[PDB]
Amino acid sequence: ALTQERKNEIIAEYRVHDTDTGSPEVQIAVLTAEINSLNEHVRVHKKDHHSYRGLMKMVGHRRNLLTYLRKKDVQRYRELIKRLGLR
């Protein structure tokens, strides 16, 4: 997991306004950070399958959120995707 602070800087950095916590711009950023953190654990611990399932579930959830954001409002999607360096 990401330490509470490490999560909070990401939340504060990707806020669309002063008080949000659940907007897609925040959830996608946090999920990207978490799966990146899990990438190297999977790389070094290659026989941990019960955590690979969690990684796959996170990837699927983040993809669904990205699809929703793209459909609803394209400009936000194309700004955020460039900010996070996705694709």
Partner RNA sequence: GAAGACUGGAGUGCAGAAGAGGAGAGUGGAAUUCCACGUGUAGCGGUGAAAUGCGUAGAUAUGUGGAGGAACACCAGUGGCGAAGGCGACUCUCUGGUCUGUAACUGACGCUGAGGCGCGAAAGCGUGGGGAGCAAACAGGAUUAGAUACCCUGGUAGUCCACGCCGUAAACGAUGAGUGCUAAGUGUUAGGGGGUUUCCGCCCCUUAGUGCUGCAGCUAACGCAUUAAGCACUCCGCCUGGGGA
9 binds RNA (CB under 7 A): no
Render the chain in DSSP notation, one character per residue. Answer: ---HHHHHHHHHHS-SSTT-SSSHHHHHHHHHHHHHHHHHHHHH-TT-HHHHHHHHHHHHHHHHHHHHHHHH-HHHHHHHHHHHT--
| List 14, 28, 29, 30, residue binding RNA (CB under 7 A) | 30
By CB under 7 A, residue 53 contacts RNA: yes
Binding site for RNA (CB under 7 A): 1, 4, 7-8, 11, 17, 19-24, 26-27, 30, 34, 37-38, 41, 45-55, 57-58, 64-65, 68, 72
